[PDB]
Design a protein around this ligand. Structure first.
Ligand SMILES: OC[C@H]1O[C@@H](O[C@H]2[C@H](O)[C@@H](O)[C@H](O[C@H]3[C@H](O)[C@@H](O)[C@H](O[C@H]4[C@H](O)[C@@H](O)[C@H](O[C@H]5[C@H](O)[C@@H](O)[C@@H](O)O[C@@H]5CO)O[C@@H]4CO)O[C@@H]3CO)O[C@@H]2CO)[C@H](O)[C@@H](O)[C@@H]1O
Ligand SMILES: OC[C@H]1O[C@@H](O[C@H]2[C@H](O)[C@@H](O)[C@H](O[C@H]3[C@H](O)[C@@H](O)[C@H](O[C@H]4[C@H](O)[C@@H](O)[C@H](O[C@H]5[C@H](O)[C@@H](O)[C@H](O)O[C@@H]5CO)O[C@@H]4CO)O[C@@H]3CO)O[C@@H]2CO)[C@H](O)[C@@H](O)[C@@H]1O
Ligand SMILES: CC(CCO)CCO
Ligand SMILES: CC(CCO)CCO
Ligand SMILES: CC(CCO)CCO
Length: 180
């Protein structure tokens, strides 16, 4: 996409959980299940506000535990998240360090979703004792996502991806150039 960001509607991803998604990089939180996506897909950098991932909805499915490769299941449910946040290339390497020259993380995954625990998404997705997984994602209509957006936290906040056709398309837009 514009800026060199790698923004595909479907693919393979790794998955983790995180706390504290109420002040996220898109500038609006949401009450439904939400995630941060790795910088190369988010479409912005820390401090620059929203990228084109903001507001888009994705169905996430875990199908492997990379730390326990002998584990065959059960995995969690498929969930639909709204992307509200950035998992930055600086400070979140093993999982979110994908760049244009090295587009996969340490698990060989070209995307990463950090699923917010606060609002319940991670409890639906991660079995007890298995808090990091790999699997798939597919962008879906936000008709498939339950929840309500939060209020704008600063000027330029954006979740307009929530009404956009799937990538390739432009809603909030990308900021600057993707990490190299
Ligand atoms: O930066 C992104 C994001 O990270 C968030 O934290 C992540 C963290 O990055 C990630 O490394 C961490 O991964 C945990 C994982 O959640 C947990 O399930 C896993 O537990 C393993 C355990 O390590 C193994 O010892 C155990 O092996 C057993 C075998 O299963 C069994 O068959 C037998 O062989 O005995 C073995 C020993 O008991 O399996 C467990 C399950 O696989 O350990 C990983 C490494 O610590 O996950 C967290 C949370 O997602 C962070 O919160 C966020 O803020 C940040 O943005
Ligand atoms: O008034 C001056 C100027 O302001 C502009 O608006 C600014 C606004 O002032 C800033 O507060 C705002 O800052 C946001 C950053 O742009 C955004 O990158 C950052 O995103 C964080 C997110 O908060 C955080 O949850 C996320 O955490 C990941 C962590 O890295 C992990 O440790 C954690 O566990 O898990 C998550 C998921 O992986 O990281 C990101 C990235 O650091 O959030 C800030 C607060 O919302 O930026 C605005 C835009 O520049 C305004 O637009 C101008 O008009 C005005 O003049
Ligand atoms: C070929 C595309 C899906 C159909 O529009 C790739 C999605 O990013
Ligand atoms: C859980 C929500 C309560 C207000 O709707 C906010 C989470 O961002
Ligand atoms: C995360 C657990 C409950 C599903 O919501 C795994 C059970 O499959």
């Amino acid at each position: 996409a514009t800026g060199g960001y790698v923004q595909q509607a479907t693919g393979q991803a790794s998955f983790t959980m995180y706390s504290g998604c109420g002040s996220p990089a898109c500038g609006k939180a949401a009450s439904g299940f939400t995630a941060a996506i790795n910088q190369l897909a988010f479409g912005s950098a820390p401090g620059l506000g929203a990228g084109d991932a903001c507001g888009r909805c994705f169905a996430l499915t875990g199908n492997h535990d990379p730390y326990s490769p002998n584990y065959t299941g059960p995995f969690g449910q498929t969930i639909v998240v709204k992307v509200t946040d950035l998992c930055p290339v600086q400070g979140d390497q093993e999982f979110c360090g994908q760049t244009t020259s090295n587009p996969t993380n340490q698990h060989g995954m070209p995307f990463h979703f950090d699923i917010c625990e606060d609002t319940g998404g991670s409890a639906k997705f991660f079995p007890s004792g298995h808090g990091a997984l790999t699997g798939t994602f597919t962008e879906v209509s936000c008709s498939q996502w339950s929840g309500s957006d939060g209020g704008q936290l600063w000027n330029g906040a954006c979740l307009s991806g929530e009404t956009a056709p799937n990538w390739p398309s432009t809603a909030c837009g990308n900021k600057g150039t993707a990490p190299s």
